[PDB]
Design an enzyme around this catalytic site. Sequence first.
Site, PDB file in Angstrom:
ATOM      1  N   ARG A  34      32.277  42.902  40.404  1.00 22.74           N
ATOM      2  CA  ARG A  34      31.794  43.213  39.057  1.00 22.74           C
ATOM      3  C   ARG A  34      30.851  44.408  39.027  1.00 22.74           C
ATOM      4  O   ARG A  34      31.170  45.442  38.436  1.00 22.74           O
ATOM      5  CB  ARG A  34      31.048  42.009  38.468  1.00 22.74           C
ATOM      6  CG  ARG A  34      31.902  40.876  37.965  1.00 22.74           C
ATOM      7  CD  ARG A  34      33.133  41.386  37.255  1.00 22.74           C
ATOM      8  NE  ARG A  34      33.673  40.369  36.368  1.00 22.74           N
ATOM      9  CZ  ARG A  34      34.638  40.581  35.485  1.00 22.74           C
ATOM     10  NH1 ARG A  34      35.212  41.766  35.364  1.00 22.74           N
ATOM     11  NH2 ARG A  34      35.006  39.594  34.676  1.00 22.74           N
TER      12      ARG A  34
HETATM   13  N1  ADP Z   1      39.889  43.715  30.749  1.00 23.46           N
HETATM   14  C1  ADP Z   1      39.872  43.421  32.074  1.00 23.46           C
HETATM   15  N2  ADP Z   1      40.405  44.268  32.984  1.00 23.46           N
HETATM   16  C2  ADP Z   1      40.399  43.997  34.304  1.00 23.46           C
HETATM   17  N3  ADP Z   1      39.867  42.879  34.833  1.00 23.46           N
HETATM   18  C3  ADP Z   1      39.288  41.942  34.040  1.00 23.46           C
HETATM   19  C4  ADP Z   1      39.265  42.171  32.585  1.00 23.46           C
HETATM   20  N4  ADP Z   1      38.658  41.114  32.031  1.00 23.46           N
HETATM   21  C5  ADP Z   1      38.317  40.281  33.039  1.00 23.46           C
HETATM   22  N5  ADP Z   1      38.676  40.772  34.239  1.00 23.46           N
HETATM   23  C6  ADP Z   1      38.488  40.067  35.541  1.00 23.46           C
HETATM   24  O1  ADP Z   1      37.779  38.842  35.355  1.00 23.46           O
HETATM   25  C7  ADP Z   1      37.400  38.404  36.658  1.00 23.46           C
HETATM   26  C8  ADP Z   1      36.169  37.511  36.581  1.00 23.46           C
HETATM   27  O2  ADP Z   1      35.683  37.585  35.242  1.00 23.46           O
HETATM   28  P1  ADP Z   1      34.589  36.585  34.603  1.00 23.46           P
HETATM   29  O3  ADP Z   1      35.172  35.993  33.341  1.00 23.46           O
HETATM   30  O4  ADP Z   1      33.286  37.348  34.547  1.00 23.46           O
HETATM   31  O5  ADP Z   1      34.428  35.406  35.685  1.00 23.46           O
HETATM   32  P2  ADP Z   1      34.014  33.916  35.230  1.00 23.46           P
HETATM   33  O6  ADP Z   1      35.072  33.497  34.238  1.00 23.46           O
HETATM   34  O7  ADP Z   1      34.025  33.128  36.519  1.00 23.46           O
HETATM   35  O8  ADP Z   1      32.646  34.111  34.622  1.00 23.46           O
HETATM   36  C9  ADP Z   1      37.231  39.655  37.514  1.00 23.46           C
HETATM   37  O9  ADP Z   1      37.997  39.435  38.698  1.00 23.46           O
HETATM   38  C10 ADP Z   1      37.832  40.795  36.709  1.00 23.46           C
HETATM   39  O10 ADP Z   1      38.822  41.541  37.434  1.00 23.46           O
END
Ligand code: ADP
Lengths: 85, 506, 473, 236, 51, 57, 89
Positions: A34
């Site tokens: 991230r």
């Molecule tokens: N628009 C996007 N483009 C590329 N990757 C995304 C996008 N939205 C989310 N991700 C992906 O979401 C993953 C984790 O997101 P996040 O929702 O922050 O984790 P969690 O749901 O565990 O909090 C990352 O691996 C990232 O690649």
Amino acid sequence: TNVISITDGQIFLEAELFYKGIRPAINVGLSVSRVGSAAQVKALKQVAGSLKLFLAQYREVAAFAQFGSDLDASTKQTLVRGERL
Amino acid sequence: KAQPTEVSSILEERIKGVSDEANLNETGRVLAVGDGIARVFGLNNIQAEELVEFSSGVKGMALNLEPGQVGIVLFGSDRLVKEGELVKRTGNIVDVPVGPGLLGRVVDALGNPIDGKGPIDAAGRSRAQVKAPGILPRRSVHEPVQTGLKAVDALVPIGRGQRELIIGDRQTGKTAVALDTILNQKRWNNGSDESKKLYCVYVAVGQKRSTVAQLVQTLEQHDAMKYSIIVAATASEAAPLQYLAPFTAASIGEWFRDNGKHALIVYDDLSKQAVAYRQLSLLLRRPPGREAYPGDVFYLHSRLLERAAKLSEKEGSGSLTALPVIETQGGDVSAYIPTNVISITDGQIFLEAELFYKGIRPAINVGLSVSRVGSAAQVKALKQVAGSLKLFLAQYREVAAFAQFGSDLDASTKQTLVRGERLTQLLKQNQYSPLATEEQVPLIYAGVNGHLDGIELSRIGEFESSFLSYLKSNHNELLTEIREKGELSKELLASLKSATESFVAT
Amino acid sequence: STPITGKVTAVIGAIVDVHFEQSELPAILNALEIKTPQGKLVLEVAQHLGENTVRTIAMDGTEGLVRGEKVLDTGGPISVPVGRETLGRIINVIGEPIDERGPIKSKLRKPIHADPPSFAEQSTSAEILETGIKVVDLLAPYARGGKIGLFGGAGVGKTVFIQELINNIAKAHGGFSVFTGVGERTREGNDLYREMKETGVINLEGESKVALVFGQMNEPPGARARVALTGLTIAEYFRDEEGQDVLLFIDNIFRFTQAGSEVSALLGRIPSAVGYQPTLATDMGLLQERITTTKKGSVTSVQAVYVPADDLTDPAPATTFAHLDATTVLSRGISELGIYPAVDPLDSKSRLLDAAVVGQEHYDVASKVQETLQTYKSLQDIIAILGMDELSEQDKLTVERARKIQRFLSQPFAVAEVFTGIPGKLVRLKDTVASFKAVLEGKYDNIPEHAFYMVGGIEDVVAKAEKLAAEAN
Amino acid sequence: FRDEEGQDVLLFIDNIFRFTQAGSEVSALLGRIPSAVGYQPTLATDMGLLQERITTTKKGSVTSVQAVYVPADDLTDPAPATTFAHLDATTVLSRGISELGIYPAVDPLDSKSRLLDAAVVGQEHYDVASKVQETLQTYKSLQDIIAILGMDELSEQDKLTVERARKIQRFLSQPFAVAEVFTGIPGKLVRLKDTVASFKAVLEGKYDNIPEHAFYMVGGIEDVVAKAEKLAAEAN
Amino acid sequence: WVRYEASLRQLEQRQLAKSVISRVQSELGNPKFQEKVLQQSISEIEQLLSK
Amino acid sequence: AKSAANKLDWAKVISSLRITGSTATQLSSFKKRNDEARRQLLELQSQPTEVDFSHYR
Amino acid sequence: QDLYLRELKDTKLAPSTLQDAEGNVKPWNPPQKPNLPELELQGPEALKAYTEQNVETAHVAKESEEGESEPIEEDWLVLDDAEETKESH
Ligand SMILES: Nc1ncnc2c1ncn2[C@@H]1O[C@H](COP(=O)(O)OP(=O)(O)O)[C@@H](O)[C@H]1O
Ligand SMILES: Nc1ncnc2c1ncn2[C@@H]1O[C@H](COP(=O)(O)OP(=O)(O)O)[C@@H](O)[C@H]1O
Ligand SMILES: [Mg+2]
Ligand SMILES: [Mg+2]
């Protein structure tokens, strides 16, 4: 699941990649960052900006190795690049 | 505004009279109030599951009467109640207002009006917990409940007094098919024959208030709120209210059933009632059974559902039709609550997302959807008439058994596959479009003759509408003949065949 | 007046027992204060244990609590400052500002515990909320006055999805928005606050049309539980007293249920299924029913449900499904193949998908998209086992088209440029419905499926196909 | 009735499992630690105490028929699994076979009885039943191979066995007189000797040409022939 | 016009509820704690006369 | 009363397998059908077109 | 009953100026005489389309057009067009 929900990214390490011969293993696709992307070294970012694209292309192409054929020149180039990568 | 004045005066005079003659001494004092339940010492003469009135105004009900203390489940928030508060026993087992004035009104679990349309006019008070009719007072279900959807009517008919479970996954059309069943009754409820009128009772237990508002406005638009009854048990409302609301709605429907009228009560959700009762048991110190569900979730569901029955002519020939729901988790029919309720209801209606996205708009899973009264509780024009309409279900099971996965054996197999595909194509029905039996029968008949030569599967959607329009023009004689007589004569079958051939020619 | 002094008798993790004298018992959910050396500790009365003892839940850490410490009763539940003053401020569960910008000069402090507005609802679930995300603008349309679920497990992309929701909506929304951040990453909250600051959404010396609530998962369970309630107090005050359309934003509504289970484990309650709190449905409904349109104003909710262990049948995600007009289920399996956002096309669902509200054209396009995707998923098993050759020409064409649509569902987000590497695209509803209608007719069958990957409209699909066919090949 | 009256008794108990369900129901509130699958600890004990009193003594005979409800269609649930050992003749009705259109829904494999012996029903009856059982077992072992790969890949003998077992599975369905509400076909009373003769004729391959549909929802082999003739007549 | 009149009735009920706070405050400052006690005492006496 | 008219119209249609290639005869047929459908829809949906001043006032 | 009579006349006099007597409204400062009778009287008209629906604007039905009295050109053109298609039946 919960630990991924806390940490700011994960570095997955395949067991088969460890057994196959890739000593650091690390699934290049599953592993994701991230906040280190903005923190990455700028020269390293320049030289590795397209590295993710090439590794993803190999991850797709390796599912095409079953029907050993011409496979089009682009897929052969991606394979012969990503294997060295 | 003299009305608020005199109602306030009357209520305050009644309060004064109660104060003048109360002599409440054995009334209880709260020891420990938990999360929506309180344990109270005293009430040495309290009846089990008897309503009580706390000093703060929150009503209660007595599930467990331990020696010394009794557990009181609160019909509301525990904000107001505190330790040491007086509790006033009402002296009567919890009941709900019942009668014909409940029609056109939305009420809570206790029956109090929540639609803001004024006080509830009730012909009487019926206990929330009422013993189900015995073996003799009931009668075999023969009078059909016209759902207005092709698939459910043809394959899993519901009759007056039948208990048909709408089992399905999340947002798979359970409350939707409940709504089409609800709305189709406007054809007969707008008439005068009370023997065909079918008053409706919706149980919104666990649904959100926005969904209940959606429901009441939808019923308002299609001239249906006048004969329907909404018993709403909001999730924000106390869990005892969710537990009790289906029972009170069952009493409301039993009022119609015992007075010679036919009532359709849709126990929509009822899995939210199950989990609310699980909460009741798990804070009432009752040890749970399976997956932390209490022991009597089966007894609860069975006792609640068995109140729905078709009474005999000696008892007024009334009926009370149940339409419970089960919200399965990931299509898990083989789960405790699902198979438990299926063992209660007189058949189940299965809906999965698989058929919902596959195109089947009613999402009627003809396999696991079975009705316990096939020939009975069905329109005579639709039951067997030509024979194929009777083994319609067996033909669907065959089509499933030799679907596209099976090898296309020969021309007979190709014809069977085409017949099945066209038939499942026909069964799709748009929402809020109750299609009457006088119009269902020609379509089901057309699914046996003239079905195979349909021009593309997708065009059957418009073909159905065109066939309805064709039956409306200079064929309304046939429509009213099959609507009124009920049975189909040989000349009627010949006329229907001729009309089908004439239409398929065009 | 006369202070109500209580004595601490038990400190069970995040739960503290307080004993009072005769006729000084605080009611359930009252706020209790103890003068700890680090400041003040707020206790919410969870149960009355009898004998003038109350079981309370801590708003902060219970370390340093000595049995018998004096407990002060505030006389009511926790009061959080409300009004336009709180806009642009960061507030924790207690109500004190944590943005280090001075105390909030709010005229009123409404309690966090309020009754639902009952049957003051409206059936106004007919206005499509144009979010710019083509998949939700097509498969699961969002309601301006409704509730959006936005499900998902670990990873999947739920946080970036909601952040994109603020970026597209709150920038040009006619009203205020409230973000609660219920049990999420504090670094995520800091980054998202900075992102609004850069965009001018929260201008410290300006309008600052957005109020921020925090108290992330680093806080004890009582906080994670009541931060949703205080954010709801902010939203309700803006919705009723101000008469404004409010954009609620809850980063993880599941964490409230997790905290409820955590405190119930210490509340002396026999656990529910999967060891949850028995009252999970009751508290969850009480939480969600404060999010209603109401006669005055309107609320958009926008939730984000975390499914434990990627189990969609978990009791809390199963319970929250009912209290959501539209949901957006993000499946990890789709995330593996790379189609991002990872929303499940045939598990999101929306009550708004009806021809009366949609228009019978976009509805038909969505229905046919679901048709193709459901057929694709049904045939996945034999596709893996046998392959595409075994299918007939119609099935092969359907599978190829469904693959094309599933690739097309991927859309770049402006808040995820560092991840995609491609500038974000905001696709209008008419644009995406026309594009997917054109795709469904087979007008773009010759175009490779990779051209639908990380694109916006059909014009972007054509551009990418041309670039791949000419520059790359 | 059995002891004092000295009369043969048919004790029909419909879904005896409700007894164990109620025992587990009251056990939780009776201060009893729940057993596996949340049942009463004593389930075997009180259930056997009930079941043994149902027996044939020297004073009379009780031909009891007891239905058993399996929760979640799971045959491994403690109540029915333990009830199995208390029962002479067993008839298992699985949802899977019912889903294929066989309305009697009796799964032919686990439906086993102690009377299935050459010394009781006769050598020919045992041979016919055993041949039927191996045909259905060979079918069941070929569920996945046919479903995921195809019937074409099987050998000619395997194809013949599969089609004969399909015909047999269809032939298992029988019109019940009380089931005319669902089938719409009048119920038929197929005799024991008629059933044995029909199934030994089918196992011999005498009616391999008859379509599978003619065996659906029929009585004896004569009914199969009549339905096949009617199907041929209507097909033209 | 019908549901406008219904809303008008709801609004007048709400305004009566609003005036209820002033009604309560009227007796809050009223030295009512003596006549009320005597009245409730004699009411209790009358209640127990029957019993 | 309308049954005879459309009965003879579709009798002519049944005779019309030989005059195939017509342009607006079928178009006029759907025009009549649409107009009569709008007729019966408006007549069925038409509530009593008067305010019930006795009660509804 | 002292618990009854005093609360009774208190609940009578507080809305007395509100409803019975024309003393505006004492319990709350904002006036009610020019608000619900006067400002809210157009409330249903404010929510609805004022001076557009409450007046029930009646549009006289437009006269249904026809062949516009073309007894020569229309008939001849129809006959010629039918003649064109009659050679390809
Ligand atoms: N628009 C996007 N483009 C590329 N990757 C995304 C996008 N939205 C989310 N991700 C992906 O979401 C993953 C984790 O997101 P996040 O929702 O922050 O984790 P969690 O749901 O565990 O909090 C990352 O691996 C990232 O690649
Ligand atoms: N004819 C139809 N039958 C069933 N569902 C439909 C139909 N038409 C549209 N739908 C959609 O399917 C959904 C049905 O889910 P619903 O019955 O509300 O289940 P739940 O109440 O459990 O969420 C609705 O949201 C609706 O948008
Ligand atoms: Mg529903
Ligand atoms: Mg997150």
